[PDB]
Symmetry: C2
């Protein structure tokens, strides 16, 4: 829906409510087919019980899939997606969303309502119609230089860090929580 | 109202050989935080530009390991480019027309002297132009013109799994494929 330029705007009004969701065991190959077909580069990921566990983006594939050096059909997106799902509340002003994305090096994130349900996805493109020139440049620079901190699904507090081998391949992402023993 | 790209481009770009695997090329991108590489052949010719989107659209669908595919079959080709004397507004029109968010910049002689990205342009473009480039990058995809006839476009040929086997020229009068 056309709205014209405005300094303020609640995210809910500009987000994409027609977002697509995919299961967390979907392979990278099958997930990307959906992205290419729909010209949609952000998918919400759900586990087998309907819980929103992450967001799969182009950058997540470049940063977390390619380095594993495996065929796209051999890697479930749960190992690639941004997790926990990046998100902002539906009542956020575009300015607040910009700060959230920039802080996390993201160019898109999910939007959740008060009850916590995912109601849409908002991207830099959506925001570009309202943000200041400087804010847009900020998000762009932050997306190039920063990377989202993925948290451990086992303890929920540990940070998943890359473990490389001699070929530079990411063997696994290991939880940084001392009290936790998790690798994937 | 005016600003030529040569002034804002990045002449500090990185070049990789066209036989570099997707795996090695992406490692370079990730380590440098630069998601655009100029690709050259074995004789010093600038033959293409490897971008994130090119990997998502032309590498992933092949369902092959990153170390088994040379970037020459993935990169944008012919190489996306604008002349160094182009005004930023002209570059914006070029990127948008081609669904790109970055392209190479060449000098009179024709060699690549830099790379210009949407981020570089974001400081000199109107908000409308920036949004335009963003929209076009999502909705349009770069057209890989056939090198043999120059008019046909290379289209993916899929197998029963939806895996890309080759990119074949659309021109009926042409037999090119890669
Ligand atoms: Hg953990
Ligand atoms: Hg051709």
């Amino acid at each position: 829906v056309p709205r014209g330029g405005h300094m303020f705007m609640r995210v809910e009004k500009i987000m994409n409510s027609n977002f697509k969701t995919v299961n967390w065991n979907t392979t990278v190959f099958d997930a990307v087919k959906i992205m290419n077909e729909n010209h949609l580069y952000g998918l919400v990921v759900k586990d087998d019980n309907g819980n929103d566990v992450g967001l799969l983006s182009e950058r997540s594939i470049i940063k977390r899939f390619i380095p594993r050096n495996k065929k796209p059909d051999e890697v479930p997106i749960r190992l690639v997606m941004r997790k926990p799902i990046p998100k902002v509340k539906s009542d956020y002003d575009v300015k607040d969303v910009a700060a959230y994305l920039s802080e996390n090096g993201l160019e898109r994130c999910a939007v959740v309502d008060d009850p916590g349900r995912v109601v849409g996805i908002v991207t830099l493109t959506d925001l570009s119609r309202y943000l200041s020139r400087a804010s847009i440049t900020d998000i762009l620079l932050s997306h190039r230089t920063k990377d989202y901190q993925h948290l451990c699904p086992k303890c929920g507090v540990g940070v998943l860090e890359p473990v490389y081998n001699e070929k530079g391949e990411i063997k696994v992402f290991r939880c940084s929580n001392p009290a936790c023993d998790y690798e994937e």
